[PDB]
Amino acid sequence: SGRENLYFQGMTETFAFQAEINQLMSLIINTFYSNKEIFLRELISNASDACDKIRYQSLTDPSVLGESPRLCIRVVPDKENKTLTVEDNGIGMTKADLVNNLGTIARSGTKAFMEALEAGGDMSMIGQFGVGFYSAYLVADRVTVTSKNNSDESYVWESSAGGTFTITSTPESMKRGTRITLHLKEDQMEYLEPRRLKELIKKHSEFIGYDIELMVEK
Numbered sequence: 001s002g003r004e005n006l007y008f009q010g011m012t013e014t015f016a017f018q019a020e021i022n023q024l025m026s027l028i029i030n031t032f033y034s035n036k037e038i039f040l041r042e043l044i045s046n047a048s049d050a051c052d053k054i055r056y057q058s059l060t061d062p063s064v065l066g067e068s069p070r071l072c073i074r075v076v077p078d079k080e081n082k083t084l085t086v087e088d089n090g091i092g093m094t095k096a097d098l099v100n101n102l103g104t105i106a107r108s109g110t111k112a113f114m115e116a117l118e119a120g121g122d123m124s125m126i127g128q129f130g131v132g133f134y135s136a137y138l139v140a141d142r143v144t145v146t147s148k149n150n151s152d153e154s155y156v157w158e159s160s161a162g163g164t165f166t167i168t169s170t171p172e173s174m175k176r177g178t179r180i181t182l183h184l185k186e187d188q189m190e191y192l193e194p195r196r197l198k199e200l201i202k203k204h205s206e207f208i209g210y211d212i213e214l215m216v217e218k
């Protein structure tokens with residue numbers, strides 16, 4: 001009468017965020033900040049880290065790469081849907097990884113980061129406080145993370161920073177890796193511009209050891 005029923009189509013589970021993470025998300029989504037572009041660097045850094053994980057695993061067991069051995073990153077603007085997406089074919093996240101690493105496990109630097117912000121600290125230091133992912137809310141009102149790890153099924157994590165996130169699964173599903181889609185806020189449409197993205201990618205990617213392909217629309 002669940003996943004095994006002939007008529008089953010999918011399931012969505014709702015989770016609350018760890019208290020400080022919720023506080024941080026409310027702070028980020030509502031704050032005024034004049035250098036919001038740093039969100040892109042955080043997305044690319046996470047893609048790179050995920051590619052490193054599978055790359056090193058592949059040195060002992062090449063079979064982990066399956067049919068996608070060429071590790072790379074894609075940046076996908078979508079003017080029609082008002083979304084910016086960052087895709088990788090890195091290690092991917094299991095259902096547990098999504099629930100644990102994206103909202104429920106406490107990050108020791110969460111409190112210190114919010115305290116730093118009030119004291120005149122730099123929002124660009126977000127990554128150094130171990131909460132880089134949440135910078136997406138500087139430019140987006142909704143974030144959708146689709147991920148597939150070799151040891152699990154594909155799942156979709158989603159949140160509009162309202163105190164909860166969802167985890168969605170379907171019987172059929174996404175190759176290994178992660179796709180992070182940001183639904184941009186009304187005044188953040190510049191991150192859909194090819195020129196703005198090309199320069200921003202070049203700005204914080206001389207150190208990234210993977211090809212970063214900017215997908216052109218129209």
Ligand SMILES: Nc1ncnc2c1ncn2[C@@H]1O[C@H](COP(=O)(O)OP(=O)(O)O)[C@@H](O)[C@H]1O
Nearest residue numbers: 046047050090092093101130131132133134178
């Ligand atoms: N593209 C991705 N692929 C795999 N795991 C990811 C990805 N993006 C984020 N994560 C996970 O979310 C966690 C939190 O990301 P972040 O807030 O940037 O912290 P950090 O990179 O310092 O660990 C990461 O540690 C990782 O487990």
Ligand SMILES: [Mg+2]
Nearest residue numbers: 045046132133
């Ligand atoms: Mg990171």
